[PDB]
Amino acid sequence: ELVMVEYRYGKAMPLIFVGGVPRSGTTLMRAMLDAHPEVRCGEETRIIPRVLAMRQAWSKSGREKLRLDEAGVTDEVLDAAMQAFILEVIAKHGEPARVLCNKDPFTLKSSVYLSRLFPNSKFLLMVRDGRASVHSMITRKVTIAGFDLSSYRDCLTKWNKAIEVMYAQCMEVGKEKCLPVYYEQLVLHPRRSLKLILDFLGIAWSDAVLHHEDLIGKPGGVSLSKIERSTDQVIKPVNLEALSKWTGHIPGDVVRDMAQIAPMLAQLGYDPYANPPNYGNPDPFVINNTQRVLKGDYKTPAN
Amino acid sequence: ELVMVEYRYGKAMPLIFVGGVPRSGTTLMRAMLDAHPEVRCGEETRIIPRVLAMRQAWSKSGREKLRLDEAGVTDEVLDAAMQAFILEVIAKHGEPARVLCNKDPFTLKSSVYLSRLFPNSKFLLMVRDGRASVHSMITRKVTIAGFDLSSYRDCLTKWNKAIEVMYAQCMEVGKEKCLPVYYEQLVLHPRRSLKLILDFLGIAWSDAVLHHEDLIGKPGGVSLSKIERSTDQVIKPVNLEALSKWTGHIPGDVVRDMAQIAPMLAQLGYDPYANPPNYGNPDPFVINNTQRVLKGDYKTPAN
Ligand SMILES: Nc1ncnc2c1ncn2[C@@H]1O[C@H](COP(=O)(O)O)[C@@H](OP(=O)(O)O)[C@H]1O
Ligand SMILES: Nc1ncnc2c1ncn2[C@@H]1O[C@H](COP(=O)(O)O)[C@@H](OP(=O)(O)O)[C@H]1O
Ligand SMILES: [Mn+2]
Ligand SMILES: [Mn+2]
Ligand SMILES: [Mn+2]
Ligand SMILES: [Mn+2]
Numbered sequence: 001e002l003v004m005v006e007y008r009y010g011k012a013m014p015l016i017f018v019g020g021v022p023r024s025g026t027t028l029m030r031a032m033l034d035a036h037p038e039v040r041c042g043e044e045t046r047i048i049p050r051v052l053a054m055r056q057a058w059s060k061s062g063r064e065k066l067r068l069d070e071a072g073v074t075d076e077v078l079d080a081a082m083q084a085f086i087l088e089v090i091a092k093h094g095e096p097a098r099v100l101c102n103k104d105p106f107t108l109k110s111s112v113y114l115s116r117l118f119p120n121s122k123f124l125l126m127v128r129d130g131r132a133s134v135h136s137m138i139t140r141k142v143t144i145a146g147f148d149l150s151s152y153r154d155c156l157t158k159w160n161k162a163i164e165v166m167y168a169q170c171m172e173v174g175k176e177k178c179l180p181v182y183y184e185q186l187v188l189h190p191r192r193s194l195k196l197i198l199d200f201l202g203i204a205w206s207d208a209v210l211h212h213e214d215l216i217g218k219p220g221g222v223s224l225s226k227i228e229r230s231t232d233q234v235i236k237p238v239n240l241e242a243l244s245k246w247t248g249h250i251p252g253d254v255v256r257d258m259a260q261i262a263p264m265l266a267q268l269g270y271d272p273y274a275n276p277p278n279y280g281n282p283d284p285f286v287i288n289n290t291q292r293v294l295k296g297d298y299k300t301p302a303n
Numbered sequence: 304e305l306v307m308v309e310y311r312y313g314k315a316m317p318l319i320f321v322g323g324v325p326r327s328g329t330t331l332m333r334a335m336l337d338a339h340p341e342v343r344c345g346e347e348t349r350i351i352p353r354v355l356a357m358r359q360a361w362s363k364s365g366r367e368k369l370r371l372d373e374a375g376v377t378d379e380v381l382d383a384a385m386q387a388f389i390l391e392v393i394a395k396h397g398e399p400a401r402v403l404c405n406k407d408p409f410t411l412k413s414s415v416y417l418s419r420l421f422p423n424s425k426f427l428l429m430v431r432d433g434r435a436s437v438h439s440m441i442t443r444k445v446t447i448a449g450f451d452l453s454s455y456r457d458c459l460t461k462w463n464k465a466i467e468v469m470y471a472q473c474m475e476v477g478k479e480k481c482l483p484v485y486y487e488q489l490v491l492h493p494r495r496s497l498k499l500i501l502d503f504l505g506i507a508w509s510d511a512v513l514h515h516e517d518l519i520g521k522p523g524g525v526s527l528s529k530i531e532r533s534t535d536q537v538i539k540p541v542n543l544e545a546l547s548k549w550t551g552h553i554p555g556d557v558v559r560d561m562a563q564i565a566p567m568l569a570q571l572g573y574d575p576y577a578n579p580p581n582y583g584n585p586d587p588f589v590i591n592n593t594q595r596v597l598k599g600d601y602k603t604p605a606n
């Protein structure tokens with residue numbers, strides 16, 4: 001059980017994995033967890049999904065898997081090495097905390113596997129209206145492998161397949177180990193959302209999760225990468241600006257076919273025929289954050 | 304310090320890394336070490352060089368290294384994760400032993416890095432006449448990334464660059480941590496060679512290293528992959544059949560330019576103008592092995 005200064009980490013520890021399709025509020029979610037005094041998530045590691053994908057490709061190739069098994073590099077060996085690699089990155093790339101956490105969006109395509117490597121780990125799958133996520137990719141020019149930012153239809157098709165896989169993984173892991181978290185409900189009702197989430201995680205309530213913007217860059221708080229694309233959004237308090245700014249910007253033929261391009265919308269409970277849906281009524285807390293954000297209380301940082 | 308059954312392993316343990324350009328006697332070398340009662344090398348892991356190459360490419364890209372540093376995934380973090388990953392594979396893919404060892408040929412392109420990750424590790428760089436190694440690749444159709452098996456000139460050019468890099472790494476690591484082992488001298492004088500090698504390693508002499516063919520497939524002995532391309536050679540005792548069977552098979556224009564294609568030949572002490580060199584006089588031990596091999600005492604295994 002390797003140490004950090006005095007916190008011990010190991011494959012049996014309670015870990016939190018946060019993920020989902022990029023542009024779904026995954027940075028906001030992990031920032032609110034980072035605010036909790038018992039948790040550290042930190043920035044996207046980038047390398048954890050890369051080594052997962054490679055290791056999965058080794059076993060999917062019949063030829064490579066035979067060579068590896070003949071060499072004694074069995075699944076048992078691959079699994080022990082993946083555990084060791086992932087724990088070191090999670091443990092070392094940020095401050096120590098009692099509960100460690102990782103947010104790399106596409107790790108949730110592998111939640112079944114991760115839940116076997118880490119038997120007391122839990123998963124938060126961020127779910128956001130595919131139309132809002134795709135509009136974010138395209139307008140912010142966020143580069144994602146496989147997503148052609150010149151085509152709403154292609155991005156929505158890829159969004160649909162991505163969340164289809166991650167949602168199935170979530171369902172296979174089961175209600176005790178993976179919780180779908182709806183972005184729109186997180187923004188409309190942050191206190192109610194975090195209360196359910198922390199209860200699902202087995203972690204005591206702390207108000208700090210509702211104050212993540214007080215804790216940017218502070219010891220025990222929210223560490224941000226200046227390069228990550230959500231940084232200038234997450235430094236503000238929870239607000240409504242991004243709930244449905246996609247309405248009106250989707251080509252008419254894609255609106256027409258929305259239910260066929262993205263059947264996962266209705267699977268997940270979204271109204272694929274509304275432009276936009278009424279997602280709910282915001283807490284006064286969030287209404288007040290929103291008007292302050294829109295009127296200019298929060299300045300763009302110089303960096 | 305993770306355990307195995309009772310042997311403890313960790314980043315400070317004495318490890319042996321064996322490598323060199325493929326087709327240079329690296330399997331024979333590691334088989335003779337596997338014969339020693341204190342050492343286990345085992346089969347090529349395949350994945351250790353793959354993850355090294357990826358991790359090196361992360362830091363060589365200015366853009367990726369900035370993103371990683373901004374995420375807290377520094378060299379210190381990358382290095383701890385590489386140590387953890389590599390130790391698990393080395394430790395788990397074969398039987399436990401007091402001294403662990405790994406043979407993946409191209410790991411010796413990274414011996415400086417490996418010697419920093421593993422401060423009591425040592426390196427055996429196998430050196431074989433580039434003409435014999437390239438002739439082996441081509442005639443046995445051994446697939447190596449970058450080596451065009453239709454061109455002796457291209458393979459010799461790639462051989463030359465490969466051994467140039469590994470030899471420089473060996474020299475930078477220094478005489479106390481890396482030993483060039485000449486294939487031809489290993490075959491001509493196996494006892495004298497292994498006595499020097501084991502002294503360089505700080506390991507007591509054991510006759511077992513001269514009996515590796517008695518120990519194929521046995522507990523505490525030499526484990527082989529049925530798929531690896533040297534398996535049907537290494538099951539025989541040390542012999543002379545492969546010393547210079549390349550003579551006469553190299554195109555005349557390549558013989559003409561040998562010193563310019565492969566200046567590393569003369570750097571390493573080989574005669575690039577002789578077809579072939581007289582590499583030395585064999586021990587009677589090896590002369591007797593050779594005639595038994597050539598007359599058919601050792602049958603091709605049914606598998
Ligand atoms: N404080 C905050 N309140 C509400 N949404 C926020 C937020 N900080 C970030 N988000 C939203 O999180 C989305 C990014 O999710 P991710 O981190 O998974 O890429 C961005 O949506 P938009 O690009 O549409 O504005 C951003 O607006
Ligand atoms: N018992 C043995 N005696 C001598 N050479 C041996 C040997 N077992 C294997 N080798 C040689 O080791 C070379 C392979 O090196 P590597 O394991 O690094 O790919 C092969 O050369 P050839 O293909 O020319 O016959 C093989 O002959
Ligand atoms: Mn915290
Ligand atoms: Mn506050
Ligand atoms: Mn940072
Ligand atoms: Mn042994």
Ligand SMILES: [Mn+2]
Pocket residue numbers: 513514517
């Ligand atoms: Mn014997």
Ligand SMILES: [Mn+2]
Pocket residue numbers: 069070071072346526527528529
């Ligand atoms: Mn085997």
